[PDB]
């Protein structure tokens, strides 16, 4: 049916000797105060909703996505004494509970509820079990205050102790053995003069002992940790969001904290404390190492000795933990996690075996303990705790998690493909194990602002994959996957490289049998919506369908709105001639090409948006609907978890319809059952 009207107010301006037409500038006005925009929004929204309600793929997609949202989650466990402590959510609870059970209880034994914050406006922030596991300290936030109250519970019976610590803020919780706790606090009244104190259990807070302050440095913050064997206090101090810190240490002898001395006295680099064993401490250091390194500090001598036990590599070092007798170092290796193991002195001990390609978050475990744990997630694996045997560097399943699918029924693959200029770009391809040929494919990208698109679990993407579609994600230049050079290679005058990389991804998938010639759909949001708009103008023949969300579509005027002036660092400056010419070559709103058949396009945005003003999407839609670009629908869907499910179902039904995807279930369980029926 014919599109709703998009009246033009003719307007042509001179910019750098060129004429620029902008007939829909009126669509930049706020929908809340401009009748003309409100009327257009109401008409387009109703027009799109009427079309989308007709797509027969929608029902099955909405049902799949709803079923994927809510599931149980386990936190990384902490073993102390006779007990193991871990958070658990059923999938339904506003806050996780803290559970505890005997350390030797079988995996899968229901834990005892130690804290249930849902029965308390009052949130559990942090918790720490004592060294022997008999007491638990926890931090409580009332409302949205930055202040905390630290409270304690006895673990055996789950009953509160009397002790409460007030005026705690921006603090750790660190036990000094079994009956004292280091914490940071401020004066009972401005975040000045934060101080580290020691609380002894069974005494009032007024009996607490001061441990560390910097009385000539009022803006300096201080957090305290204790090595796992209780031998060293380590105080990390910083000021003002630069990722650098000082380090002070104090020897603990017979429960008593010795003099606090400066180990790294100046604010020059990142020094993140890992743990200590004996009189050796390990840190992740940024000193002379943008991608970080591991430094061992030996304090047994009269002067600290620094040894780099794992030097800076080619890969970014994200985090390090110690477990068993080893260091476990989580790196970003070709846009995904590689966890390497080392002896404490740096000797390589190989890579940790992971279930497949994905992202590793934290590690839990202790020196001398044979049970360690690693958090893992990927496109077909919601974040899960794996058991890690630190002596063999092998992961295995820990607690079973009930999901509506089996992660082993899917495969994440990674390829590296040449862009126009020969640059090898990584791409992930994710498919259910019934895929035995070309499939309708959803290709996602962002490509900007140093954003690294490492694997994560998206319920929306999983809906597509578990409906029989292929998913692909390209780690385009402009991102942070290979650091600052990668970012610089896709911004400013080189922004077009991002678009070439993405077009080459699309070509590769077709050429290499992942996707049919007419079965490629593309999606992206914000800077990723610009990506979609730009490649749609340049190669409309490559894509069956496209959905730009909240896209920056007018690249000549992006800095005229709210927040968009901050984006000049990647996009350049429209007031500058040379930067303007670069922008004019790809601004999606200014590059719609009549006479050429465009893909089906579903633009999405809310009717107000502080980050990317909706006017970008509104004017871009008016341009597409006005242009002579063939018969496929060029539509705008104009809008909490409930809203996101509806949007995802609409978008995916649209993309499925235009790529030939018929949503179908499959599982290896059902394949086996089908195979066995024949033998009767």
The CA-atom distances, in angstroms, between 116 and each of 80, 88, 160, 282 are 20, 10, 13, 35
Strand 122-129 vs strand 147-154: parallel, antiparallel, or unpaired? unpaired
| Backbone φ and ψ of 114, nearest 5° | -90, -50
∠ Cα 546 43 556 (to 5°):
55
C-beta separation of 321 from 362 below 8 A: yes
Cα torsion 510, 416, 381, 545 to 10°: value is -30
How far, in whole angstroms, is CA 358 from its chain's centroid? 12
- CA-CA distance, 24 to 492, in Å (whole number)? 26
Q: Give the chain's largest Cα–Cα span.
A: 85
> DSSP secondary-structure letter at 308?
E
- CA-CA distance, 462 to 36, in Å (whole number)? 39
First to last CA, the chain: 54
What 3-state class would DSSP assign to 25?
Answer: helix
- CA-CA distance, 151 to 163, in Å (whole number)? 6
Q: Which domains does the chain have, with CATH numbers?
A: 11-71+403-680 (3.40.50.1820), 72-402 (2.130.10.120)
- CA-CA distance, 432 to 440, in Å (whole number)? 12
Length of the chain counted residue by residue: 680
Cα torsion 94, 95, 96, 100 to 10°: value is -130
How far, in whole angstroms, is CA 24 from its chain's centroid? 36
CA proximity to 85, closest of 139, 47, 138, 45: 138
Strand 209-212 vs strand 195-200: parallel, antiparallel, or unpaired? antiparallel
Strand 246-253 vs strand 359-364: parallel, antiparallel, or unpaired? unpaired
C-beta separation of 167 from 123 below 8 A: no
- Specified resolution (Å): 1.8
SS3 track for 631-644: CCCEEEEECCHHHH
CA proximity to 234, closest of 252, 253, 249: 249
- CA-CA distance, 475 to 332, in Å (whole number)? 13
**Helix, strand, coil fractions of the chain, as percent rounded to 5:** 25, 35, 40
Look-up of token digits 């970080």: 292
Q: How many helices (H) and strands (E) does the chain have?
A: 11, 40
C-beta separation of 324 from 366 below 8 A: no
Please list, in sequence order, all residues whose beta carbon lies within 8 angstroms of the beta carbon of residue 360, skipping any fewer than 6 positions away.
330, 337, 339, 352, 354, 374, 375, 376
C-beta separation of 341 from 351 below 8 A: yes
**Sign, Cα dihedral of 445, 446, 448, 451:** negative
- CA-CA distance, 224 to 359, in Å (whole number)? 29
Look-up of token digits 């499910």: 645
∠ Cα 255 261 265 (to 5°):
145
What 3-state class would DSSP assign to 437?
Answer: coil
Please list, in sequence order, all residues whose beta carbon lies within 8 angstroms of the beta carbon of residue 216, skipping any fewer than 6 positions away.
none
| Backbone φ and ψ of 390, nearest 5° | -70, -25
C-beta separation of 83 from 102 below 8 A: yes
């Amino acid at each position: 049916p014919p599109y709703p009207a998009s009246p033009q107010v003719p307007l042509v301006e001179d910019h750098f000797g060129e004429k620029v037409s902008d007939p829909w500038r009126w669509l930049e006005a706020d929908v809340r105060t401009d009748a003309k925009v409100a009327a257009w929004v109401q008409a387009q929204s109703a027009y799109t909703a009427a079309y989308l309600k007709q797509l027969p793929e929608r029902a099955a997609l909405e049902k799949r996505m709803k079923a994927l949202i809510d599931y149980e989650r386990f936190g990384l466990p902490q073993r102390r004494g006779a007990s193991v402590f871990y958070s658990w959510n059923s999938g339904l609870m506003n806050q996780s509970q803290l559970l505890v059970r005997p350390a030797d209880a079988p995996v899968g034994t229901k834990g005892r509820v130690l804290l249930d914050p849902n029965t308390w406006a009052t949130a559990l922030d942090a918790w720490a079990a004592s060294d022997d596991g008999r007491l638990l300290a926890y931090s409580v936030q009332d409302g949205g205050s930055d202040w905390r109250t630290v409270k304690f519970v006895g673990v055996a019976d789950g009953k509160p102790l009397a002790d409460e610590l007030k005026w705690v803020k921006f603090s750790g919780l660190a036990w000094l053995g079994n009956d004292a706790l280091l914490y940071s606090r401020f004066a009972e009244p401005l975040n000045y003069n934060q101080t580290v104190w020691l609380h002894r259990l069974g005494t009032p807070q007024s009996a607490d002992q001061p441990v560390f302050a910097t009385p000539e440095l009022p803006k300096r913050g201080h957090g305290a940790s204790v090595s796992s064997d209780g031998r060293w206090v380590v105080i990390t101090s910083s000021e003002g969001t630069d990722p650098v810190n000082t380090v002070h240490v104090a020897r603990v002898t017979n429960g008593k904290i010795g003099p606090v001395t400066a180990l790294i006295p100046d604010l020059k680099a990142q020094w993140d404390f890992v743990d200590g064993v004996g009189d050796q401490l390990w840190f992740v250091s940024g000193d002379g190492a943008p991608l970080k390194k591991i430094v061992r500090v030996d304090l047994s001598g009269s002067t600290p000795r620094f040894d780099t036990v794992v030097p800076e590599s080619k890969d970014n070092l994200e985090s390090v933990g110690i477990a068993g007798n080893r260091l476990f170092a989580s790196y970003i290796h070709d846009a995904k996690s590689q966890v390497l193991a080392f002896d404490l002195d740096g000797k390589p001990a190989g890579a940790v075996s992971l279930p497949g390609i994905g992202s590793a978050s934290g590690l839990s475990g202790r020196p001398g303990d044979r049970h360690a744990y690693l958090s893992f997630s990927s496109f077909t694996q919601p974040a899960t705790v794996l058991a890690l045997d630190p002596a063999t560097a092998k992961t295995t399943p820990w607690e079973p998690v009930h999901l509506t699918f089996d992660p082993a029924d899917f495969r994440v693959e990674q390829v590296f493909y040449p862009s126009k200029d020969g640059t090898k770009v990584p791409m992930f391809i994710v498919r259910r194990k019934d895929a035995k040929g070309p499939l309708p494919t959803l290709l996602y990208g962002y490509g900007g602002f140093n954003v690294a698109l490492t694997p994560w679990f998206s319920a929306g993407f999983m809906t597509w994959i578990d409906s029989g579609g292929a998913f692909a994600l390209a780690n385009l230049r402009g991102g942070g996957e290979y650091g600052d050079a990668w970012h610089d290679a896709g911004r400013r005058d080189k922004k077009q490289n991002v678009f070439d990389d993405f077009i080459a991804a699309g070509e590769w998938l077709i050429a290499n049998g992942v996707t049919p010639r007419h079965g490629l759909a593309i999606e992206g949001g914000s800077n990723g919506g610009l990506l979609i708009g730009a490649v749609t103008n340049q190669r409309p023949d490559l894509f069956a369908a496209a959905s730009p969300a909240v896209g920056v579509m007018d690249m000549l005027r992006f800095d005229q709105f709210t927040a968009g002036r901050y984006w000049v660092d990647d996009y350049g400056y429209p007031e500058k001639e040379a930067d303007w010419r670069v922008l004019r070559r790809y601004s999606p709103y200014h590059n719609v090409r009549s006479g050429v058949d465009y893909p089906a396009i579903l633009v999405t945005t809310a009717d107000t948006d502080d980050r990317v003003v909706p006017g970008h999407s509104f004017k871009y839609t008016a341009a597409l609907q006005t242009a002579a670009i063939g018969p496929k629908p060029h539509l705008i869907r104009i809008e909490p978890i409930d809203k996101q499910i509806e949007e995802t179902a609409d978008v995916q039904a649209f993309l499925a319809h235009f790529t030939g995807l018929t949503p179908r279930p499959w599982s290896s369980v059902d394949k086996l059952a089908a195979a066995l029926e024949h033998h009767h």
